């Protein structure tokens, strides 16, 4: 079983690789694991340090946009788990082009090379942001694509490329959509690590707009497990939501973070709101529960405590990133 994981040196991808190599996914035979990652500002070899010497791992410093490389690296690969992408909304508003280049064009190159290489199946990792914003209720897999940021539209375009590969060429590609993830090794440009590390440095927390925005949080371990279940038992062309359950306003979350670190509101700063900021995300995960048996297993309280502790203990890791 040869598996290729793109974006495996990033936050979620590295967790997937680590778990896999650790044997957390018995149903996912992985005798050979190739990680393909271009090492952008978000890719970090340290994320794979724990599995560095594993004889089953091959690390490829390269790009999904590189057709030649792929045509070689995908030879005899049975499956691909695709996490490689530009992932930050803020960066997408500031410089949008890279998002279409990596997310849409990169996905197309990858999927065409998969077809050319006879790859058996692909799990295309996506996000709940393709659905825009939802005032009340939760989105299901049939919800409309109404992305509001360049990042979200790039992911949605990638999802559409995946569909077309399945419909035109018969490629067995499965799509997952998940809510905000959190956990160790998340880059500090993201909300939780940013705020936790800012407090660790005795700094302020830049709370966008009024902090009323709502996000659903899932520990990355749960997301990864959902992906492994889709990889092992999903169906060609299907979309699967992987949720975490827990919905919080950014204000609520900030309070929780402050509490966790013994800090107070005085460390918060109201800053201009993000342009086109999505008010609320909420996913319905009944499909994957009923069809594949997935449900989040890490409680926010526990997961969060552990994450904060991780940041406390790994300044050497995050400091250089800030």
Ligand X SMILES: NC(=O)c1ccc[n+]([C@@H]2O[C@H](COP(=O)([O-])OP(=O)(O)OC[C@H]3O[C@@H](n4cnc5c(N)ncnc54)[C@H](O)[C@@H]3O)[C@@H](O)[C@H]2O)c1
Ligand Y SMILES: Cc1cn([C@H]2C[C@H](O)[C@@H](COP(=O)(O)OP(=O)(O)O[C@H]3O[C@H](CO)[C@@H](O)[C@H](O)[C@H]3O)O2)c(=O)[nH]c1=O
Q: Summarize the annotated binding site for dTDP as residue ranges.
A: 180, 190-191, 206, 208, 215, 250, 274
Q: What mask of x and - would describe binding to ligand X in positions 172 to 191, judged by CB under 6 A? A: ------x-xx-----x----
Nearer to ligand X, 13 or 147 (CB): 13
Instruction: Kindly list the distances between the CA atom of residue 151 and the CA atoms of 174, 277, 291, in Å, as whole numbers in the listed order.
Output: 20, 12, 29
Nearer to its own copies, 271 or 301 (CB): 271
Is residue 54 at the binding interface for its own copies, with CB under 8 A as the rule?
yes
CB 21 within 8 A of CB 30: yes
Count of residues for the chain? 322
Is residue 271 at the binding interface for its own copies, with CB under 8 A as the rule?
yes
Which part of the chain contacts its own copies (CB under 8 A), choosing from 27-35, 118-126, 269-277, 292-300? Answer: 269-277
Cβ neighbours around 133 below 10 Å, total: 16
Q: What mask of x and - would describe binding to its own copies in positions 84 to 113, judged by CB under 8 A? A: ------------------------------
Residues 6 or more apart whose CB falls under 8 angstroms from that of 174 comprise: 121, 122, 123, 124, 230, 231, 234, 235, 236, 237, 238, 239, 240
Structure tokens at 17: 């690789």
Instruction: Kindly list the distances between the CA atom of residue 148 and the CA atoms of 39, 57, 191, 248, in Å, as whole numbers in the listed order.
Output: 27, 38, 19, 20
26 to 65, contacts with ligand X by CB under 6 A?
37-40, 42-43, 63-65
**What is the closest distance, in whole angstroms, from the C-beta atom of residue 122 to ligand Y in the complex?**
19
Residues in the annotated binding site:
11-12, 37, 40, 63-64, 83, 85, 87, 102, 151, 155, 180-181, 190-191, 206, 208, 215, 250, 274
Nearest to 164 by CA among 152, 153, 155, 173: 173
Nearest to 46 by CA among 303, 321, 304: 321
Nearer to ligand Y, 111 or 257 (CB): 257
Nearer to ligand X, 7 or 150 (CB): 7
Structure tokens at 249: 């306003």
Nearer to ligand Y, 223 or 225 (CB): 223
Torsion of CA 308, 194, 298, 2, to 10 degrees: -110
Residues in the annotated binding site for NAD(+):
11-12, 37, 40, 63-64, 83, 85, 87, 102, 151, 155, 181
**What is the closest distance, in whole angstroms, from the C-beta atom of residue 154 to ligand X in the complex?**
9
**What is the closest distance, in whole angstroms, from the C-beta atom of residue 289 to ligand X in the complex?**
18
Residues 6 or more apart whose CB falls under 8 angstroms from that of 271 comprise: 206, 207, 208
Structure tokens at 144: 């409309």
236 by DSSP, 3-state: which? coil
Residue 204 binding result from ligand Y, ligand X, its own copies, none, given CB thresholds of 5 to 8 Å by partner type: its own copies
Is residue 128 at the binding interface for ligand Y, with CB under 6 A as the rule?
yes
CB 250 within 8 A of CB 297: no
CB 107 within 8 A of CB 30: no
Q: Which residues bind to ligand Y, rule: CB under 6 A? A: 87-90, 127-129, 179-180, 190-191, 194, 206-208, 213, 215, 250, 274, 281
Q: Which residues bind to ligand X, rule: CB under 6 A? A: 6-7, 9-13, 37-40, 42-43, 63-65, 83-87, 102, 106, 125, 127, 155, 178, 180-181, 187
Q: Which residues bind to its own copies, rule: CB under 8 A? A: 49, 52-55, 203-206, 269, 271-272
């Amino acid at each position: 079983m040869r598996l290729l994981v793109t974006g495996g040196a990033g936050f979620i991808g590295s967790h997937f690789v680590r778990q896999l190599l650790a044997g957390a996914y018995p149903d996912v035979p992985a005798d050979e694991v190739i990680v393909l990652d271009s090492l952008t500002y978000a890719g970090n070899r340290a994320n794979l340090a724990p599995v560095d010497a594993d004889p089953r791992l091959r690390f490829v410093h390269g790009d999904i946009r590189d057709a030649g490389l792929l045509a070689r690296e995908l030879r005899g690969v049975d499956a691909i788990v695709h996490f490689a992408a530009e992932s930050h909304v803020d960066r997408s508003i500031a410089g949008a082009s890279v998002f279409t280049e990596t997310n849409v064009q990169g996905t197309q190159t990858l999927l065409q090379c998969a077809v050319d290489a006879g790859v058996g199946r692909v799990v295309h990792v996506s996000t709940n942001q393709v659905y825009g914003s939802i005032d009340s209720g939760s989105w299901t897999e049939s919800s409309p694509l109404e992305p509001n940021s360049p990042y979200a539209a790039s992911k949605a375009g990638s999802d559409l490329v995946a569909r077309a590969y399945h419909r035109t060429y018969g490629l067995d590609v499965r799509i997952t959509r998940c809510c905000n993830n959190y956990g160790p090794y998340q880059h500090p440009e993201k909300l939780i690590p940013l705020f936790v590390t800012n407090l660790l440095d005795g700094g302020t927390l830049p709370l966008y707009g009024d902090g009323a925005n709502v996000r659903e949080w899932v520990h990355t371990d749960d997301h990864c497990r959902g992906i492994a279940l889709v990889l092992a038992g999903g169906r060609a062309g299907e979309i699967y939501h992987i949720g975490g359950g827990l919905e919080l306003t950014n204000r609520e979350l900030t309070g929780i973070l402050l509490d966790s670190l013994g800090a107070d509101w005085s460390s918060v700063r109201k800053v201009a709101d993000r342009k086109g900021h999505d008010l609320r995300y909420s996913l319905d995960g009944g499909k994957i529960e009923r069809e594949l048996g997935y449900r989040p297993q890490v409680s926010f309280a526990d997961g969060l405590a552990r994450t904060v502790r991780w940041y406390r203990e790994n300044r050497g890791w995050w400091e250089p990133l800030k």
